[PDB]
Design a protein around this ligand. Structure first.
Ligand SMILES: [Ca+2]
Ligand SMILES: [Ca+2]
Length: 96
């Protein structure tokens, strides 16, 4: 399956419009969509105590040029730069 093929797969599930640019609105839909059954006991890895907190940090580390939207080029470049972020994105694909 390779790692690169899996990276593009996650982006395809994120970018709803498939324009190569993931926006804040697109991220909100993902957080609401992928959040059904995330465990059976205790799984503290995303303490959502606010609607705007885990999005700013994720976007600040994703958007390279900081144009206001994340792109496939930046996401792929950042995914190979951070292990923590890449681990979280892998959970979304492994959640199904
Ligand atoms: Ca988009
Ligand atoms: Ca960008």
């Amino acid at each position: 399956g390779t790692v690169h093929e899996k990276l593009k797969w996650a982006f395809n599930l994120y970018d709803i419009n498939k324009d190569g640019y993931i926006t804040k609105e697109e991220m909100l839909a993902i957080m609401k969509s992928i959040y059904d059954m995330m465990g059976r006991h205790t799984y503290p890895i995303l303490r959502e105590d606010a609607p705007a907190e885990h999005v700013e940090r994720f976007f600040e580390k994703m958007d390279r040029n900081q144009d206001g939207v994340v792109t496939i080029e930046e996401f792929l470049e950042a995914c190979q730069k951070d292990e923590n972020i890449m681990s979280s994105m892998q959970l979304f694909e492994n959640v199904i």
